Amino acid sequence: PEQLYSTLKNILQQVKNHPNAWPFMEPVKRTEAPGYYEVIRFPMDLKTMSERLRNRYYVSKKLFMADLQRVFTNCKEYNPPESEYYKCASILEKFFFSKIKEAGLIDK
Numbered sequence: 001p002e003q004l005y006s007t008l009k010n011i012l013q014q015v016k017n018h019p020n021a022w023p024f025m026e027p028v029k030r031t032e033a034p035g036y037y038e039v040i041r042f043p044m045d046l047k048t049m050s051e052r053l054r055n056r057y058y059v060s061k062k063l064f065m066a067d068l069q070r071v072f073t074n075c076k077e078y079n080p081p082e083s084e085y086y087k088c089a090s091i092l093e094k095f096f097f098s099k100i101k102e103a104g105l106i107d108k
């Protein structure tokens with residue numbers, strides 16, 4: 001557990017401090033995206049992920065990876081490809097992928 005928790009903490013740290021992480025630091029507000037919570041069925045953001053991680057809710061890598069991936073896929077499904085949010089999501093998603101591959105967390 002201690003090795004996994006250490007790895008996941010470092011990953012989320014690097015992701016949340018990335019220059020393209022800013023759109024994902026807090027949950028999407030209804031007022032800023034009317035209808036978001038109708039069309040995006042499972043919202044996720046990095047504050048929520050930090051709360052879940054700190055609460056020791058991620059006893060497997062799989063939940064953590066799925067939640068973090070969904071931050072980016074939600075963004076890239078909702079927003080226009082030419083939007084800054086979409087572009088940030090694409091960049092940060094690639095960073096995320098590099099971090100999980102670096103840690104040996106991809107399925108063998």
Ligand SMILES: CN1CCC[C@@H](Nc2cnn(C)c(=O)c2Cl)C1
Nearest residue numbers: 023024026027028029033075085
């Ligand atoms: C709370 N708010 C702070 C600024 C950035 C924003 N991020 C959004 C907003 N709307 N939508 C639709 C998004 O996809 C994102 Cl990432 C979230």
